[PDB]
Design a binder for this molecule. Structure first.
Ligand SMILES: O=[N+]([O-])c1ccc(O[C@H]2O[C@H](CS(=O)(=O)O)[C@@H](O)[C@H](O)[C@H]2O)cc1
Ligand SMILES: [Ca+2]
Ligand SMILES: [Ca+2]
Length: 667
């Protein structure tokens, strides 16, 4: 539905009002800015020197039988064209192209209603409903603290501009869902700011001279996500062994791994894996114990690993490793990359050395098909053929904007696109070895296409604290925001990661986090950056026993989880779901941030505060059974006892899975 008067028009798409334009209230501005983008250790400082911002108030429409073409102008020397058409699947397609490259800013307004909620924009840690705020979309480090009013954030800012803020994330994406039951996906990867704060419109700011946007509607959110994932990609099914226990994050070598494994197994903990990020060596820095970034098994630290991997596998234990797409400048791979011209370049034509925190690395130029192939062979040869069942595929958010890439695309454009590219490299390693569905890699950074190429997201680095913006809590909006952006497999470090400034992980925080992760599709621990300052999974007999209990819980859910994972693969129906996917008529479910459905039938509200013996949450109208007592409940706000090991989890009494669920209160 396109309606027009002289310099005035509206566009409806399946009855959603998308655009309105008039001389008085334009939908389009263009102009120009000079980007001053600086990075220190992945923490970006983005300044614009805005030169112009010009409202294109004149619009001349011409019509094809396949669309409308709108010439916008403000005099002869300022103009842009908007083509409105349908793409090959009938999605609404807007193509914008400014007059010339000098006009490298776009602001486009979309119509909205005050009541609309907005979800998505990738992986968001402070907000799930985005309505009422702007979100800059620039992949970076996620922040330490992430709130200017908390102390840790202030410390991290002083120390290295590292505290961040509510919108910082390693997986921003220019994709959102409206409670008008449509999504909007922007194909650009330039800097963008999605402004959701005006009651009557959404404003999308693009730092480019052109923009493509697609929209699709549906009658339910589930169908909408089916459509969104038809566009962006659907993840494979998880390997069957992911459901079989906890993956133990261990460092310090083979014997330590063995000793800890045995401690856990012998106490009855269900262990499916050992994840040893230091498989390649350790680098000590002031931040803490980091990995040596040269992607080859270090047999001095991990003697007999080649054989031990298989002995572990014989007992149902996978070995997981660590790789990122950078290479330590003081090691072999970086040298080999340098010799073949496989590294991103600086303006002088040298290889760009990035400062990563008291060491330097090259950036493997994944835009060079040869470097891409070579790096994929590194994975295949040095990890898959070694016998890894999986790995952390980390980073992807750190490309500096003054690197020069083999494909000739500006680093200011390639920066945001990097994660998906890295994801694809991993995905293809698996695909080329027949290991999709068998090997599992997990990623932190993401971008458009991570929905196809990342077999699992993890929530990156939480503080080992109970903060809303960077603690246990924040993982839930991260998971739900991703679900709404088309990625339905999400987990977090059991216990958090970031151990700085007197933050140290308590036993209590370890156990609460364990209770949370038992109700997600993957259980995996982390030592954190300072292992010896954090409570760990084997800190005492009670911790071990808690793990044996909650791993038993997790493994009981295996068939349920697997079905939910199948559904994710088949139709983009995410494993951790916002309540409104199934309780659409309940207005209260649209504003929940810290509870989710695990599958259709289990409602989870993790305790995210220290010192609680009870917990308050919302049950939508259904017949619920408390998992630990069998107690029946109906909808409305409820407070339950929530000691450690009995997280606030409820299941639908009418679930075909009810007898499985009913066995939980007997563990
Ligand atoms: O920018 N930094 O310096 C920075 C440091 C550590 C970061 O953590 C990431 O990297 C760690 C490995 S390492 O310390 O960089 O070798 C892994 O243990 C974490 O799980 C992962 O999220 C991420 C970034
Ligand atoms: Ca008219
Ligand atoms: Ca953080």
């Amino acid at each position: 539905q396109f309606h027009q008067n002289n310099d005035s028009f509206t566009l409806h798409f399946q009855q959603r009002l998308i655009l309105t334009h008039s001389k008085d209230n334009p939908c389009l501005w263009i102009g120009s800015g000079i980007a001053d983008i600086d990075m220190f250790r992945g923490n970006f400082s983005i300044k614009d020197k805005l030169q112009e911002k010009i409202a294109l108030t004149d619009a001349i429409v011409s019509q094809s039988p396949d669309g409308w073409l709108i010439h916008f102008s403000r005099g002869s020397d300022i103009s842009a064209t908007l083509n409105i058409s349908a793409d090959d699947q009938g999605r609404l397609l807007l193509e914008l192209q400014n007059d010339n490259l000098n006009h490298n800013r776009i602001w486009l307004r979309l119509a909205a209603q005050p009541e609309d909620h907005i979800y998505g924009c990738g992986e968001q840690f402070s907000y799930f409903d985005l309505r009422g705020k702007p979100f800059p979309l620039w992949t970076s480090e996620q922040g330490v603290g992430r709130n200017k009013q908390t102390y840790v954030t202030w410390q991290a800012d002083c120390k290295e501009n590292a505290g961040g803020d509510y919108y910082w994330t390693f997986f921003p994406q220019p994709t959102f869902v409206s409670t008008q039951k449509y999504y909007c996906h922007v194909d650009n990867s330039c800097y963008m700011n999605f402004d959701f704060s005006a009651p009557e419109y959404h404003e999308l700011a693009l730092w480019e001279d052109k923009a493509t946007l697609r929209f699709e509607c549906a009658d339910t959110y589930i169908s909408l996500l089916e459509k969104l994932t038809a566009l962006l990609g659907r993840q494979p099914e998880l390997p069957d062994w992911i459901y079989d226990g906890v993956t133990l994050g261990i460092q310090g070598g083979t014997e330590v791994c063995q000793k800890k494994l045995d401690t856990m197994r012998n106490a009855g903990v269900k262990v499916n894996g050992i994840w040893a990020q230091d498989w390649s060596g350790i680098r000590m820095t002031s931040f803490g114990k980091r990995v040596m970034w040269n992607w080859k098994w270090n047999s001095e630290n991990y003697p007999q690993l080649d054989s031990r991997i298989k002995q572990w596998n014989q007992e149902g234990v996978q070995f997981l490793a660590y790789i990122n797409p950078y290479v330590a400048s003081d090691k072999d791979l970086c040298e080999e990359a340098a010799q073949h011209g496989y590294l991103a370049k600086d303006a002088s034509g040298g290889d760009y050395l990035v400062e990563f925190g008291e060491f330097y690395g090259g950036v493997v130029d994944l835009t060079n098909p040869e470097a891409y192939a070579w790096f994929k062979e590194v994975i295949k040869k040095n990890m898959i053929e070694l016998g890894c069942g999986g790995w952390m595929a980390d980073f992807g958010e750190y490309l500096p904007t003054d690197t020069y890439l083999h494909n000739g695309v500006s680093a200011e454009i390639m920066h945001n696109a990097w994660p998906a590219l890295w994801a694809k490299c991993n995905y293809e390693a698996l695909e080329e070895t027949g290991k999709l569905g068998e090997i599992l890699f997990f990623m932190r950074a993401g971008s458009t296409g991570s929905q196809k190429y990342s077999t699992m997201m993890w929530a990156g680095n939480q503080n080992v604290d109970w903060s809303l913006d960077d603690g246990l809590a924040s993982v839930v909006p991260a998971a739900l925001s991703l679900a709404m952006t088309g990625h339905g497999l999400h987990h977090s470090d059991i216990g958090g990661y970031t151990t700085l400034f007197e933050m140290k992980r308590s036993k209590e925080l370890l156990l609460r986090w364990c209770d949370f992760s038992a109700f997600t599709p993957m259980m995996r621990t982390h030592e954190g950056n300072r292992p010896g300052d954090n409570w760990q999974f084997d800190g005492d007999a009670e911790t071990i026993a808690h793990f044996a209990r909650m791993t038993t819980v997790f493994t009981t859910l295996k068939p349920y989880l697997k079905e939910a994972v199948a559904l994710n693969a088949k139709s983009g129906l995410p494993v951790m779901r916002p309540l409104f996917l199934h309780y659409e008529d309940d207005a209260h479910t649209y504003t929940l941030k810290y509870q989710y459905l695990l599958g259709r039938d289990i409602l989870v509200a993790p305790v995210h505060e220290e010192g609680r013996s009870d917990w308050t949450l919302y049950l939508p109208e259904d017949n619920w059974v408390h998992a630990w007592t069998g107690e029946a409940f109906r909808g409305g706000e409820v407070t339950v006892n929530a000691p450690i090991g009995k997280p606030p989890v409820f299941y639908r009494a009418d679930s075909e899975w009810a007898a499985l669920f009913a066995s939980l209160k007997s563990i």
